[PDB]
Paper text:
The FAM46 (also known as TENT5) proteins are noncanonical poly(A) polymerases (PAPs) implicated in regulating RNA stability.
To understand how BCCIPα binds the FAM46 proteins and inhibits their PAP activity, we sought to solve the crystal structure of a FAM46/BCCIPα complex. Strikingly, the structure showed that BCCIPα adopts a structural fold that is completely different from the structure of BCCIPβ published previously (see details below). The structure of the FAM46A/BCCIPα complex for the first time revealed the fold of BCCIPα. Furthermore, A DALI search of the protein structural database suggested that the fold of BCCIPα is unique, as the search failed to find any protein with substantial similarity to BCCIPα. Consistent with the published structures of FAM46B and FAM46C, FAM46A in the FAM46A/BCCIPα complex adopts the same bi-lobal structure, with the PAP enzymatic active site residues in the cleft between the two lobes. The N-terminal lobe contains a large β sheet that is covered by several α helices on one side, whereas the other side of the β sheet faces the catalytic site cleft, presenting the conserved catalytic residues, including Gly122, Ser123, Asp139, Asp141 (for binding ATP and Mg2+), and Glu215 (the catalytic base), to form the active site of the enzyme.
Residue numbers in the entry:
A (entry chain A): 63 to 169, 179 to 392
B (entry chain B): 57 to 93, 123 to 206, 214 to 225, 293 to 322
The structure:
Amino acid sequence: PNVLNWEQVQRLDGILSETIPIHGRGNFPTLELQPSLIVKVVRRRLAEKRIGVRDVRLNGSAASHVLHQDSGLGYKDLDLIFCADLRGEGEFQTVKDVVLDCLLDFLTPLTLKEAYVQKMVKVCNDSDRWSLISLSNNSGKNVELKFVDSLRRQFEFSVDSFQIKLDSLLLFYECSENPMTETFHPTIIGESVYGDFQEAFDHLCNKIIATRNPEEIRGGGLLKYCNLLVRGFRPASDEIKTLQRYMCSRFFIDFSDIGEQQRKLESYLQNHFVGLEDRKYEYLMTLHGVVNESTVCLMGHERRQTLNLITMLAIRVLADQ
Amino acid sequence: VNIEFEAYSLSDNDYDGIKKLLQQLFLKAPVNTAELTEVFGFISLLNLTERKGTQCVEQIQELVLRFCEKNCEKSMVEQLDKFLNDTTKPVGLLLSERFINVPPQIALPMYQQLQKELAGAGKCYFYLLISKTLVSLKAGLIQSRSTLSDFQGTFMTVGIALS
């Protein structure tokens, strides 16, 4: 059911026991940190400070890797969620101090912070009361410790909407000898944001896209959709016309100017495409395909000037071998 | 409503680009001469009235969420120009209307008490600060205790530019 099988469990242990580089900027001593070690000690020092953790989860490219290695979503980002009950203004400070009391062990909080920390964002608004710490790595591999009390709905694809509760596995780590075999394997529960975990995993199996909360479609939603489309995730949706109309509309609303478009495509080509080459040019033509075929409210001159911005960039990719 | 942002993985060119972007706003600001008794940025007292208040928080939180992308270190300065220096943007207008660059003797006290509010544990303050010692683009919008009740007023953006 929701309970992970063995091979999934072994892969989960994989990306969480295999170390990550904490590259050195300013203070140069790099740090080989095993994700399991940080997840444990963070949860521990948090519960020790009487904060009250509900669940520690895993999200995105990683959980979609442990469930089904076949799908294109490659484990290149470790997204860790710490579902908890943080309400006091000081609760976020001691969460900060816990993560920094943890990264000194593996080697003053302010200095370690200014060295290896990429981002520290805390949002206390109408529905979002979450905190985030992104540890830096020169290889672009990104680790995100997200401590989320309450979080608004978001535009979610099926195959990206996966969350696996690491708590049953954490127990096996504090026992001296990790007591893990095919027979003694922690029952780990996988879950989905998009909806029924049975539905969502099936989508992951046979390369289908499907959405929920299209009300919260973001500007760049069209871009990420073609990334699924370029990764063989064909939308079986025959409601794809509306969806494509839905995301194209918001892309040109949020990025009305042509120069503002070029900057977004230049960045998405640069960052969101790593270790990919024909994929870049393929991506540009499938975006072209979606725009020319599906959009339905771009002005005449706007349509051409956008489509021709894609073709120029595809020339740049071709011209670079 | 707190929203606090800290980014330290910034390039030296990104520091200079935001410094220049910030100092163009300083040119648009009248200086306080003969009226009174590395960090670069501004501190703006933002009364949370349902109009100008809510619109600004809309824009500030939207940019912060826009900065939570996987890397976005390049698109930072482009987004900052079109954010703090643009038109029909409740924030850029706030930075164009009542902006005052102040001398060191006044500005240091503000950066000091601001730092203490963000670290210790009223008036709503919207700030953006770049510091090099180590780049530290720190911005946010935090409910706190008075930092410059003496000279600052509602929707008045104080400029902190020191060495």
